[PDB]
């Protein structure tokens, strides 16, 4: 006698071949429903099966009812069989993998010019410029429905859904069809990756392709250390390139290790690093603003960032951390700092009193500034954000008080017309105060704080965000997922969340998100840059994008997957390393200053050579020698030294000064994480982050956490020469190495 053991012994009837309905397993004393498939587009809740052009695996699971209990089943892989009417060309290797492919006859060679018909004006313009970048040929947009080489068209009906697409290649041209304009955009990514491998020709055949999961995401901690907008748009295009579509951005956070200031005689509430990256009218009675003072986003900048990411299929999800990680808020309202008992009293200043109604009032006001209409924009700043993340990971006080606050902030978003996302913490914070679940998204980041199984039964849509598997803390001893890309690529599946496993077809499973946390910042900051973590961010993407969009099994080895990542290269019109196209040098003998150069910024490795003479060095006045949006090369700083400021706002000093009134030969050597200075051939010093060096001065010993490496990556600015340089520049040379 089985007793909802039935579920792990079920017998799926044959499924015949090319059937229309999923046959159902029957067991005498039990009632058995269909929970769902991993490809809802192939086997729906109603059990109806869609045709396939190539044999595709689908994982179904069930609810077995017998006596008064249930349990959801294990996954059953059925494989929908296609009619093998033909066979032809092999499937093109794409990241992520194409689900279905029917090989065809021959090739479609491209002409000296390419024409494209597209009913989406903004999509068609995007597509054509990505085309010219990859091909080098020049691409024409034709009327939507005129005679063209590649024709994008919106198909009605079908199973594709908002992210599917039918890509068809014949030797008379290419025809991309989708149900929504968003799946048409993913079709371009597939076509562009092929054209990356064979720019002259694409094999004939039909490609039908679906994402297995709805939410394929990357969170970025843009609060503990700054990230310029230009970098975040490199991230949007690189995610779109691997068909990832969820950019979760932490807008406010603060330095974790407030103890470092306490144990050394300082006030963390007064010196710990905190940030709120969005522009805000909010200011405290003491005039202190909520918006971060070193780098922030204006409301229009952010509103435009969200619309840009939507053009490339990515939904930006902004997060406001409360009541924890809220040192930016408590600095406005010290009277709301939680005062109750707690387990690590040295980290109090970052905690809002979630029990105080005058705290929910404040958090609501901050939210409303972006959820309600903005006067200047004529619409909310978060107008294009369907999902807003309300934070709510932890509260040091009563568990019931946490639940009341969690329910307040989740419902605030629901009543303002927004879907909320929350860090799963209800297992850690159980209680009788009801917390809303229907309409609410939850990040399953830790199993001790929220069990995946009890999250789905309480009624949440869940996102695999598991810390042991998907957290990256750059250059840290713990949370180094960037050294496990091989294991992720081979074993990681979205429905296994820590040591729990959901069925891949559970409808409340949205997908998964990997996370980048910048813990070792402030008085621990090594000086690393958004450039310095690009390789692991982009490399985390190219692995997880396969396991999020594709089937449960990697189509190749990790080693083959990485040499395909190389053939396909960066995303169209995306140069995150500022590599130059030709390694010939740039030579300038300036006529007078400032000289305008108008060359692209140059990343490592490079060497800068200049013959110059400093005519004056008034004290306290900065002297910009090289300038571009990526940063400034400071001939003289406020302390008199040579150094530079990056576009992430971190400043660095070489510790050397230029002689006033002397001809000097200046060389600067740019390497990954090392920028070196040589004056007259002699080593003048190596760059050191100056941003948070104070405060930690007088800490003396017992600051075992001072940064032990000094990283100073510097993308060379090359737009204007000698902006505010009080001197002459005789000769200047830039050389990629
Ligand atoms: Mg564009």
Author numbering: 20 to 756
Question: What text appears in the publication on this structure?
Answer:
The crystal structure of Am2136 (without signal peptide residues 1–19) in apo form was solved to 2.9 Å. Am2136 consists of four domains, in which the central II and III domains correspond to GH20b and GH20 domains separately. The catalytic domain III was flanked by domain I, II and IV, in which the majority of interdomain contacts were established by the galectin-like domain IV (1099.1 Å2). This galectin-like module adopts a closing hand shape formed by two antiparallel β-sheet sandwiches (β23-β33). It forms several hydrogen bonds (R665-G546/Y547, R730-T545) and a charge–charge interaction (K714-D717) with domain III, by which the extended V-type loop (V707-T732) can participate in the substrate-binding pocket formation. Hence, these results demonstrate that the specific interactions between domain III and IV are an important integral part of regulating the hydrolysis activity. The residue E413 provides a proton to the aglycone leaving group during the oxazolinium formation step, and then abstract one from the nucleophilic water during the oxazolinium hydrolysis, while D412 stabilizes the oxazolinium intermediate. Thus, Y415 is a crucial part of the hydrophobic pocket necessary for substrate binding, this interpretation is further supported by the obvious increased Km value (2.32 mM) of mutant Y415A. According to molecule docking calculations, the most probable nucleotide-binding site of Am2136 is found in the cleft between domain III and IV, located at more than 28.6 Å from the active site. Five critical residues (S249, K252, R256, Y550, E649) that form direct interactions with GDP.
Akkermansia muciniphila is an anaerobic intestinal commensal bacterium which possesses specific β-N-acetylhexosaminidases for gut mucosal layer colonization and mucin degradation. In this study, we assessed the in vitro mucin glycan cleavage activity of the A. muciniphila β-N-acetylhexosaminidase Am2136 and demonstrated its ability that hydrolyzing the β-linkages joining N-acetylglucosamine to a wide variety of aglycone residues, which indicated that Am2136 may be a generalist β-N-acetylhexosaminidase. The GH20 family has the largest number of β-N-acetylhexosaminidases, and they generally utilize the substrate-assisted mechanism. Among the known GH20 family members, Am2136 is unique for its possession of additional N-terminal domain (D21-G107) and C-terminal galectin-like domain (D601-L756).20 The galectin-like domain usually acts as a sugar moiety-recognition module.
